[PDB]
Amino acid sequence: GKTNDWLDFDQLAEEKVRDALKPPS
Amino acid sequence: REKELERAIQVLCRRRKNNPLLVGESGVGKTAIAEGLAWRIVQGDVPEVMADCTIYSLDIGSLLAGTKYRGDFEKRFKALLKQLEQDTNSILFIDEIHTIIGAGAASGGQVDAANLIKPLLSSGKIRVIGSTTYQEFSNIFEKDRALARRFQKIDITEPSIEETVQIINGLKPKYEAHHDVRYTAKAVR
Amino acid sequence: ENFTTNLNQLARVGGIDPLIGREKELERAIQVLCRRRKNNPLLVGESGVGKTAIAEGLAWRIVQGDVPEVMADCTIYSLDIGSLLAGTKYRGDFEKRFKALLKQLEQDTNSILFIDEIHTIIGAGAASGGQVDAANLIKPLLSSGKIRVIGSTTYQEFSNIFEKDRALARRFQKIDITEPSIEETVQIINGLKPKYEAHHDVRYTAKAVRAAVELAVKYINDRHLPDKAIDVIDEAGARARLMPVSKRKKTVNVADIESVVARIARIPEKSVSQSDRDTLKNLGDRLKMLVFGQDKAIEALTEAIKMARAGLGHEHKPVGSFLFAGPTGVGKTEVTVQLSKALGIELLRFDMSEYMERHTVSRLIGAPPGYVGFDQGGLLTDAVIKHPHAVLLLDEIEKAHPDVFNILLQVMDNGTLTDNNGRKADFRNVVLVMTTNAGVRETERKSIGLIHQDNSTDAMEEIKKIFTPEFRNRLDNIIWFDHLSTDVIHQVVDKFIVELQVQLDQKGVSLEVSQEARNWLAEKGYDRAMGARPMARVIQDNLKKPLANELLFGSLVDGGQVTVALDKEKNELTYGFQSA
Ligand SMILES: Nc1ncnc2c1ncn2[C@@H]1O[C@H](COP(=O)(O)OP(=O)(O)OP(O)(O)=S)[C@@H](O)[C@H]1O
Ligand SMILES: Nc1ncnc2c1ncn2[C@@H]1O[C@H](COP(=O)(O)OP(=O)(O)OP(O)(O)=S)[C@@H](O)[C@H]1O
Ligand SMILES: Nc1ncnc2c1ncn2[C@@H]1O[C@H](COP(=O)(O)OP(=O)(O)OP(O)(O)=S)[C@@H](O)[C@H]1O
Numbered sequence: 048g049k050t051n052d053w054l055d056f057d058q059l060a061e062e063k064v065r066d067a068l069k070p071p072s
Numbered sequence: 073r074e075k076e077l078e079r080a081i082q083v084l085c086r087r088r089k090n091n092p093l094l095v096g097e098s099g100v101g102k103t104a105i106a107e108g109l110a111w112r113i114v115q116g117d118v119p120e121v122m123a124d125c126t127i128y129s130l131d132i133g134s135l136l137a138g139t140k141y142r143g144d145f146e147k148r149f150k151a152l153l154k155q156l157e158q159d160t161n162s163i164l165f166i167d168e169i170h171t172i173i174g175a176g177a178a179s180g181g182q183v184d185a186a187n188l189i190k191p192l193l194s195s196g197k198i199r200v201i202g203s204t205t206y207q208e209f210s211n212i213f214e215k216d217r218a219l220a221r222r223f224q225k226i227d228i229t230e231p232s233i234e235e236t237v238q239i240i241n242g243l244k245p246k247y248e249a250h251h252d253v254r255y256t257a258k259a260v261r
Numbered sequence: 262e263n264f265t266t267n268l269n270q271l272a273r274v275g276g277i278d279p280l281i282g283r284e285k286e287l288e289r290a291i292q293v294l295c296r297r298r299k300n301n302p303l304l305v306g307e308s309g310v311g312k313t314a315i316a317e318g319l320a321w322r323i324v325q326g327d328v329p330e331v332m333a334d335c336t337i338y339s340l341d342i343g344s345l346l347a348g349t350k351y352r353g354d355f356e357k358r359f360k361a362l363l364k365q366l367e368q369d370t371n372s373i374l375f376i377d378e379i380h381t382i383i384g385a386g387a388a389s390g391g392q393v394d395a396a397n398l399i400k401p402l403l404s405s406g407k408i409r410v411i412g413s414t415t416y417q418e419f420s421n422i423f424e425k426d427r428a429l430a431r432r433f434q435k436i437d438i439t440e441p442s443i444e445e446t447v448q449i450i451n452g453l454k455p456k457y458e459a460h461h462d463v464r465y466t467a468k469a470v471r472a473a474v475e476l477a478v479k480y481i482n483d484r485h486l487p488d489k490a491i492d493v494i495d496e497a498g499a500r501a502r503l504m505p506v507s508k509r510k511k512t513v514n515v516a517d518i519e520s521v522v523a524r525i526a527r528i529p530e531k532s533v534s535q536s537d538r539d540t541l542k543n544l545g546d547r548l549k550m551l552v553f554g555q556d557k558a559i560e561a562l563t564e565a566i567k568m569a570r571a572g573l574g575h576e577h578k579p580v581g582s583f584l585f586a587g588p589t590g591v592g593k594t595e596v597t598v599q600l601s602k603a604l605g606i607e608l609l610r611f612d613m614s615e616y617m618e619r620h621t622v623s624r625l626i627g628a629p630p631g632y633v634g635f636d637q638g639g640l641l642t643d644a645v646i647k648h649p650h651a652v653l654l655l656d657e658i659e660k661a662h663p664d665v666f667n668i669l670l671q672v673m674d675n676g677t678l679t680d681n682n683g684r685k686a687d688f689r690n691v692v693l694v695m696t697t698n699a700g701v702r703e704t705e706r707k708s709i710g711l712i713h714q715d716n717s718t719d720a721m722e723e724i725k726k727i728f729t730p731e732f733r734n735r736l737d738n739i740i741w742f743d744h745l746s747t748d749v750i751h752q753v754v755d756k757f758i759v760e761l762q763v764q765l766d767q768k769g770v771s772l773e774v775s776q777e778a779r780n781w782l783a784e785k786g787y788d789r790a791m792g793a794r795p796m797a798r799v800i801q802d803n804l805k806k807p808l809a810n811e812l813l814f815g816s817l818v819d820g821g822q823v824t825v826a827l828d829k830e831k832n833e834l835t836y837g838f839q840s841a
């Protein structure tokens with residue numbers, strides 16, 4: 048019997064960034 | 073928990089990096105040791121060096137309540153540290169300390185509670201007690217080598233069968249009053 | 262105004278610890294300041310090495326006067342990035358605050374700005390289209406060279422964040438800082454010792470300071486040598502200050518340092534207390550009282566532990582690595598399970614039958630970074646870190662893939678294993694006991710002849726074939742388990758009967774068994790090829806089975822008083838079944 052082959056699974060990375068505000072006056 | 077609390081008091085009495093970190097598995101009484109330290113101080117069964125000290129619990133959710141504008145978190149957090157330095161006899165308890173590592177970054181900045189506290193922990197101006205799980209400590213807290221160095225990892229081990237029955241006996245008066253029932257000596261064992 | 266702090270003024274009041282050594286690095290940094298180009302020094306180093314002390318310590322030397330005449334009059338300021346962003350609510354606040362500070366420095370040309378963790382300003386405050394990066398604001402001044410600033414960063418941060426900013430990187434001149442040697446670290450403690458001594462009102466012994474730098478580096482491997490030693494020194498002072506009455510410990514002896522390094526490193530301490538000596542010495546019958554026979558197996562486990570606690574042990578290898586082979590039903594695993602109970606330490610079990618496939622190794626050491634299972638982490642590394650002093654049990658090791666054996670080579674020879682996160686697991690105090698079933702087929706096999714031959718040698722050949730010589734050269738001992746003798750079975754029967762009594766005691770039933778009945782069960786269930794496991798079946802069918810019918814629906818609901826006897830006439834057991 049031929050040897051088995053394993054397949055890896057790569058997870059993508061994406062994140063959300065907050066936003067600070069600066070009033071003019 | 074005399075051995076655990078004695079090591080914590082020893083770390084809190086150091087000159088520099090006097091910031092214990094109660095690392096242990098969930099359910100091993102990490103918060104109990106930190107929160108119970110205050111209960112012991114009021115009762116009076118603590119070393120004289122630890123008496124007269126006030127322990128405060130930090131709610132990270134309340135700091136970021138209205139931090140919409142830039143600098144609201146920095147000013148709010150920095151002002152809090154000034155209060156501890158003034159009295160120089162107050163301790164800060166930050167449960168789930170792994171959260172403050174990334175809190176306060178607005179869009180792409182590294183300015184956070186970790187960097188804001190870092191220079192104040194290596195100098196010994198303030199004392200902070202931490203509590204976090206092994207998974208969080210290994211995967212998140214351990215990543216920041218600078219912050220990890222300042223914190224003295226105090227390991228908490230699961231108690232034995234005999235050590236647990238005395239704990240329930242001490243807690244039993246609080247649970248009996250809630251349900252208005254009584255527990256037998258055999259039921260606890 | 263209030264964002265910065267004059268480190269030179271702070272030194273005048275003792276706010277900065279003194280510097281010891283680091284002459285080569287200080288000269289390098291001072292030289293980088295004097296040069297016309299690339300005047301901004303940078304201090305790349307690992308966490309704890311002392312890079313921050315060098316930047317702040319420079320001010321201490323200036324006030325002292327032990328610096329060159331050119332660097333004799335220069336104000337050193339420490340930039341607190343947190344204070345800059347304190348009141349930066351309205352637009353233009355960051356520009357005014359940052360520009361106002363730079364104006365004071367460029368006009369003077371003598372003041373120098375020390376910015377710790379300069380990688381933080383690379384992503385300074387930006388809210389809506391402003392893109393006012395602190396690096397961009399200071400970039401033009403650094404190019405001309407009018408103002409010079411000192412920097413500090415980690416290797417990761419310098420490469421992950423600071424290297425990306427090529428414009429800043431070219432102006433800054435990297436200075437590599439390395440942890441001092443053990444001989445140099447003791448001098449540092451001697452210089453810092455008076456400050457710690459005054460705070461704790463103690464006096465560290467010259468021998469003790471040396472042990473702190475040697476014991477910590479030997480056991481504590483999670484921190485660099487300069488801060489690691491100071492932590493032991495600082496913590497030892499507090500432990501002596503918290504003495505029960507009148508501060509009995511007025512000096513820190515070597516013994517105190519050893520106790521401080523044992524608790525910090527979660528390892529057994531030296532000069533074992535009398536409480537532990539009793540159980541160690543008494544561990545000659547407790548194991549023999551539960552696991553009968555195989556005395557040589559118990560001696561190897563107890564001797565390796567005694568040697569480690571006594572102080573005579575391998576420098577980097579575990580306390581003991583053993584391979585338990587033998588027939589089925591022998592106490593290969595029971596002796597290991599009962600060893601942790603005798604010592605009162607956590608038992609780490611790992612059924613190696615689950616690791617038959619080569620790709621299954623990922624759950625032991627952990628998946629690589631960027632994978633779905635990276636967060637889960639390794640099972641062996643985490644367990645060892647949580648319980649450094651524990652008994653590891655790799656049951657059914659023969660079933661595992663040969664790749665798994667390679668992982669244990671490093672554990673036995675080096676005692677350090679690297680996980681996905683990079684943490685080093687300490688195997689110095691963990692016991693390694695891996696039970697193997699290799700060659701068991703030959704053990705129960707009967708020779709083709711009148712006289713049955715001993716297949717013990719043939720079984721060892723299978724163990725030598727499956728395990729390469731490298732694996733067998735790192736194991737402290739290979740203990741073949743011999744078959745259970747007739748007399749030994751009598752002891753095994755008593756053990757199972759005791760367990761039955763404990764089970765009946767919970768229900769409130771007692772059990773009395775005659776000596777003749779015990780001998781009958783032994784000869785009936787005795788099987789040299791099947792070990793002691795069949796003895797539990799005889800007890801189940803002859804004792805537990807009748808009692809179960811009576812316990813559920815019978816007179817033996819409570820009170821017990823059961824008696825068992827065998828009549829030679831019928832050659833069968835007699836059950837009392839007293840209601841009580
Ligand atoms: N020595 C003790 N005395 C009294 N209660 C104890 C003691 N040790 C543990 N406990 C109990 O343990 C609980 C407190 O610890 P936990 O609720 O596990 O908090 P924690 O350790 O911060 O949790 P996470 O999930 O790890 S953040 C309460 O039920 C306590 O009564
Ligand atoms: N010459 C010295 N060498 C080593 N340690 C020293 C020296 N002088 C004083 N120390 C003490 O040991 C510490 C050395 O590390 P620090 O300079 O504090 O680390 P750091 O640069 O803040 O660390 P990170 O991880 O980079 S934030 C000093 O803060 C003092 O407590
Ligand atoms: N020498 C012994 N003394 C007392 N009980 C024993 C002895 N040997 C085996 N037993 C009992 O028989 C069972 C043995 O269980 P384990 O030790 O886990 O078996 P094992 O050694 O893994 O088995 P194999 O077949 O050799 S892989 C338990 O019920 C033990 O209590």
Ligand SMILES: [Mg+2]
Binds near residue numbers: 102103167203
């Ligand atoms: Mg909690």
Ligand SMILES: [Mg+2]
Binds near residue numbers: 377413
């Ligand atoms: Mg630093």
Ligand SMILES: [Mg+2]
Binds near residue numbers: 593594656696
């Ligand atoms: Mg086995």
